[PDB]
Amino acid sequence: SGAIYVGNYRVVNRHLATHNDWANLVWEDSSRDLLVSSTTAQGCDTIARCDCQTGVYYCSSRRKHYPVSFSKPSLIFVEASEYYPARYQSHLMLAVGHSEPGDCGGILRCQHGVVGIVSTGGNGLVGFADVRDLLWLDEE
Numbered sequence: 316s317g318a319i320y321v322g323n324y325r326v327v328n329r330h331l332a333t334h335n336d337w338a339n340l341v342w343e344d345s346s347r348d349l350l351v352s353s354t355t356a357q358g359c360d361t362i363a364r365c366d367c368q369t370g371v372y373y374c375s376s377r378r379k380h381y382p383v384s385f386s387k388p389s390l391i392f393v394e395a396s397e398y399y400p401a402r403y404q405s406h407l408m409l410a411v412g413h414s415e416p417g418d419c420g421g422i423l424r425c426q427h428g429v430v431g432i433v434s435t436g437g438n439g440l441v442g443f444a445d446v447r448d449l450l451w452l453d454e455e
């Protein structure tokens with residue numbers, strides 16, 4: 316579980332998106348595992364606009380924030396699960412770290428702000444859906 320609240324938007328994992336997210340959809344991308352929906356109140360999370368490769372992420376399976384080195388967003392092959400088949404997910408960044416399915420939504424952050432949220436995992440690796448290129452989230 317977990318979301319980003321920036322302006323009048325809510326960013327969640329497309330596979331965890333609620334009924335109310337679809338009844339107010341703004342943008343969604345199955346290959347990115349991202350879904351943006353509309354909120355009534357203003358959000359206060361700042362999105363990082365940078366090329367940072369070091370940061371801190373929340374892991375709910377450990378009630379802990381872990382510092383990590385992560386690769387740049389890339390087209391990475393992801394194992395088949397009950398939400399998606401085995402395919403290449405785009406804008407994905409991998410780090411060596413603990414990750415469990417219920418961890419999806421935990422924010423990855425650098426000194427510039429919010430980099431993304433947990434999307435993939437297993438094998439002692441944790442994958443994050445980058446949001447630093449969705450420049451429109453700030454404006455409108």
Ligand SMILES: CSc1ccccc1CC(=O)N1CC[C@](O)(c2c[nH]nn2)C1
Pocket residue numbers: 330347348393396397398399404414415416417418419433434435436437438
């Ligand atoms: C943190 S995910 C994880 C952690 C430990 C083990 C396995 C996983 C993978 C998983 O169960 N899923 C469920 C949907 C998934 O998040 C996904 C796929 N593509 N985009 N989102 C991958």
Ligand SMILES: [Zn+2]
Pocket residue numbers: 363364365366367425426427428
């Ligand atoms: Zn940064």
